[PDB]
Amino acid sequence: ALVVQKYGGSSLESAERIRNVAERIVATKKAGNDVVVVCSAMGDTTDELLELAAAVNPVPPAREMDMLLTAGERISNALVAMAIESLGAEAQSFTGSQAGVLVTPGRVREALDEGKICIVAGFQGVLGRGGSDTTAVALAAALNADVCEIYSDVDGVYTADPRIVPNAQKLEKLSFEEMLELAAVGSKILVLRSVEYARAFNVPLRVRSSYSNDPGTLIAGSMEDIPVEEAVLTGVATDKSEAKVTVLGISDKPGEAAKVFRALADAEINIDMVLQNVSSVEDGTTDITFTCPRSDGRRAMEILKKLQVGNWTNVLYDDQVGKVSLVGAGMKSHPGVTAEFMEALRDVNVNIELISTSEIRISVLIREDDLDAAARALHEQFQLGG
Amino acid sequence: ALVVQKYGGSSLESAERIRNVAERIVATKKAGNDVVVVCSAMGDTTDELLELAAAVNPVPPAREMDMLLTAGERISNALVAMAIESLGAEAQSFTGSQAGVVDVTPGRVREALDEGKICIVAGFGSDTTAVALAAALNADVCEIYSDVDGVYTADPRIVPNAQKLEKLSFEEMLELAAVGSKILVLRSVEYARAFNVPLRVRSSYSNDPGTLIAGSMEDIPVEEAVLTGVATDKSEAKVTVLGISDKPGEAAKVFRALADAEINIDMVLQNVSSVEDGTTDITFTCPRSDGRRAMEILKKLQVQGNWTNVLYDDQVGKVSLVGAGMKSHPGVTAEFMEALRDVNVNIELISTSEIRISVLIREDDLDAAARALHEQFQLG
Amino acid sequence: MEEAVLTGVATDKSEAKVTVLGISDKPGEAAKVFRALADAEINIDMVLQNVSSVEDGTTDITFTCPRSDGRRAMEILKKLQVQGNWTNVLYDDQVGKVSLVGAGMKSHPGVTAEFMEALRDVNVNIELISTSEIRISVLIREDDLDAAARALHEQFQLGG
Amino acid sequence: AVLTGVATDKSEAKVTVLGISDKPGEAAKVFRALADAEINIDMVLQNVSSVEDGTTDITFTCPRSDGRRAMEILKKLQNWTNVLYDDQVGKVSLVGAGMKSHPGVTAEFMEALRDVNVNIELISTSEIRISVLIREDDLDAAARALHEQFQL
C-alpha cells in the first residue's frame, strides 16, 4: 500500500526516539508499503524558535520565518533520514515545497518507485496554514495514499476526556465531520485545517501513538455517506479555556455586527464562537455574545466598552464559563437527542446559560465548576462508555 | 568599501545578543560600506547537532550531515536577517553553496551588494569561507568577532603585564597560533596570507578595534621588525621512539600507524643519528587524549624489532617566543635560553622556525617561563 | 498558524424558525420545550439561546426545523404556554441561512469581521448568528440569499 | 588541512654540539657563543636527553659561509663530547596550515620520500610546516615526490 506518516515533536524528542521511530518506519515498508514520512521539529523546537523570532523581531518577515521554521524541521529530517539509512532503508529528503505545495508530487513518486522512503520537512518557495500536518494530508491526497497517519503521544480519539469521565472509551472510527466538530469545540487533538483537507480530498487519517503498537483511531468517510440507521453519537467535548463577552442592546441594522468584530479583529482578539438571537420587536435591539481565550478577555472588554460610549447599552464579562458539547452524526435525523441532552443536565441540576449547535453538534455554556459533572451526565445519558 | 564580518556562536548566543550584533552590522553599512556577514550556528548548536547525529547513526551519510549542519547555521542566518531588517537594512541570505562555493565564485553576492543589500552567508569552516569570500570579493578587511577582543603579547591571566597588539603580520599570527592557543582557525589565516586579505580579531561586546593581521613580514623593513608575543600550551603529551634505524621508510612506518589510528601529531622532532649504532630518536607531541592510544600502537610495533623503546610524558608544557624581528637579528635565541636559566627552568627539547623558538619544559614551570620571557624582552 | 482554510459558501431555504420568548433561566426549562417537540417527532436542526437578562431572569430560545413542520412546531409550544413558563411563541416561514464553511477561524478573527462587512455592504441584515471554529452561519431573510452569497463569494473569493 | 607549497634550500650548513649536559644554562652557553660572534641563527633542534648518560645534542643551522667558523667557535668552549660540521645539507619543507588534525600529511610526506630513497636526517615540523634536512643532491628528487604526493 501507500502510507503517509507524520511524526510530531513529541515523537522526535531525542536521538533514541528518532532511531525508534526510524525502525517503525522501516517495519512499515517491510510490510509491503511505499512510505512517505513528514517531520515536525524535535520536541518544542518550533515554539522555542517562534519565541526567538519574536524576540529578535516583532512581526518577523515571511521569507526569513520560512527559512527559520524550515531549518528547525530540516534538523529532524536529517536525523530521521540518518536513522532510516542505518537500518537498511534508502532515504530521499524533500522540503514541503520541493514536493508541490500548490498538488504536483512528481518528484516524490519517482523516489517511491525506486524503493526509497521519502521524508518531507519544512517549506521554501511561497507557512500559512497548518505546517507539517497539512503537508502530510496534502501529500496523501496528491499521491493518493491509502492512509495518512499522525503520530504523537496521543494514542487515539476518545468518547470523552478520560481524566474527567472514568468510563470513557477510545473510538475505532468516526467521520471527518464528527472529528471536525469534536475538535472544534473542545478536544484540541489535531490541526483542524489539515482535517478539513482530508475531508475535502477524501484522505483517511489515523491518530495513533509512536510509543505503543495500539492501532489508534481512524478518521474516514463522510457522515453524509453513513446510513441513517447506523449513525451514532460520538463523544463529549469540554473547554474551560474561554471567557464570554456579551454586548447588550445593539440595534438590529446592517453593519452593527461589523462595528463589533472589526474592533476585535484589529485588536487581534481570537473568536471561538459567536451567538446572536432574534431582536425584540419593541425597542428593536438584540444582544451579541462571543467567546474568546481568557487571555484575550480583559482586552476584548476594554475595546467594546470604549465603543459603548453609543452603539450599545452594556458590555458584560465572564471568565468562569465552561463549554460542554455532544457530537454525533446520529443526531442529524433523530428527534429527542436535544431533549435527552437538556434532561441529562437538568437531572444533575446544571443550569444552561447559553446554547449553540450544528447539524451534528449541541453546545451549551455553563459554570466551569459544573463541567465535570455535566460531561459525566451527558456521557452516561447516551451510554457512550463501557 | 567592502567589509566581511564573521560572528561565532558566542556572539549569537541569544536574541538580545543577535539584535546587538545586528545594530553593529547596520552601523557598518551606514558608515559607507558593502557588508557581507557569515554566521555560525547559535551557541553550541553545531556540537549538540554533532552529538545528536552520532547518536542516531555512528557513521552518518555526508548528504544528511550537510543538511543537519546547514539547518543549524540557518537558524542564526534567519534571526540575524530578521534583526537586520527591523533596523532598516534589506537582507539577502545565502547558503554558501549558491553564494560563491567548491572554489569561490561570488557572482550572486556581488550582484546583491550592488543593490545595497546586506548579504548573510550561512553554511554549505565559518571562518575559512568568510576569508574566502573576502578574497573572492576583494574585501578591504575580514573581521572575526567573538568574546576575544584581540591578540595579546601573552596570556593576560598568566602574564599580568600582557598587552593587546595593534598589528602583526600574517605569518607572525600563524606562528603564534601554531604553538599557542587557537584564537583564529589556523587554516583561515593561511588564506588571508595567501590572498592578502587583512583580518581583524575583535570583540562583539565592545567598540574596541582589536588587533589587525595584515601584510607579510617579508615586506616589512628588517630594522623595524619586533618580537610579537609569548605562547603557552599545556595540552600536549610527548612521545619519544628510541632506537630507530636511520634508513629510508622507518619514519614512514611510525607515522603511518599513528595516521591510521587517527593520532593527531604535532611538532614532530628528530635530530642527527649516532655514528656508533647508526640510530636516532624521534619525539613528537600529540593531544593528551591521544597519548595512550598513540602509545599502545608504537609499543606493539616496538616489540617487533622495529625499535628499542617508546617513552611517554603527559606532564610536558610548551612555551614559545614569536616575532619577525628574530629572523635577521642574532642573540635573541641566546636571550631566550638565558631567561629560562635565570628562573631555573630546564630546556628539555628545542624546536624552531625562522621566526619562532619553542621549548618543551615541565608544565609546572610554564607560568614562570612565560613570565620570565615576557619581561626579558620588551613585551609589556 | 494564522491563515484559515475556507472551503465554500452554503445557502439553504428549507426550514422555518420558531422562537420561544421569555423562557425562565433555571434548570429544566429547556427540557420542557425540546421534549415536547421530540414527542411530536419534530426533527429540529440549529438551536440558539443567548444569556438571560438580569432584570427578569428570562431568555429566548430560537430553533429551526423543516419548513413543513414549522407551524406545527410553534403550535405544540403555544398550546403548552398556560403557565408563567413563556410569554409568547413566534413563527417565521420565510427565513434563509447563509454560511461560510472552513477550518481554523478562531485565530483568524478578521474572517468573522469580513463576513459581517460582506453582508453589510450588500445591505443585508444579519438576524441570527451561530458560529464556531469551522463554521459561520447566519439567518437572514430568504430573499437576501442571492445577495448574501455573491457578497461572501466575492469577499473570500470562493468557489469550485 | 591546506597546503600552499613546497620550498627547497641549499644556502645553509648544520652544526651539531654532541654530549651537552641536560642541566639548566648549558644551552645559553652554546648560543651566547654564537650571539657574541654575531652568527645569525636559524634552525635549532634539541631532542630529549639520554637516561643512561644525562646528555643531548644541539643541532643548529646557519648561513653556509658562517658554518666552518661557527663549528670552530664552539670547539674553543670545551665538557662536550664533540662538534660536527656539515655543508652539503639541504632543506625541503611543506608549507601550509592545519596539519595537526590531519596526520596523513606527516605520514605521506615521509612515505613520498622513502619511495625516492632519500636520506631523512633531521625533522622539525609544526602545524604550519613539515621541514626535514636531507642530502643536498636529493633536493630535486625529494621535491618531485612531494609535488606529486600532495599535488602542488
Ligand SMILES: C[C@@H](O)[C@H](N)C(=O)O
Ligand atoms: C449584527 C446584527 O445585530 C445586525 N443586524 C447586523 O447585521 O449588523
Ligand SMILES: C[C@@H](O)[C@H](N)C(=O)O
Ligand atoms: C627516520 C628517518 O631518519 C629515516 N631516514 C626515514 O625516513 O625512514
Ligand SMILES: C[C@@H](O)[C@H](N)C(=O)O
Ligand atoms: C433557559 C434554559 O436553558 C434553562 N437555563 C435550562 O437549564 O433549561
Ligand SMILES: C[C@@H](O)[C@H](N)C(=O)O
Ligand atoms: C638546553 C638543554 O641542553 C639544557 N637542559 C639547558 O636547559 O640548557
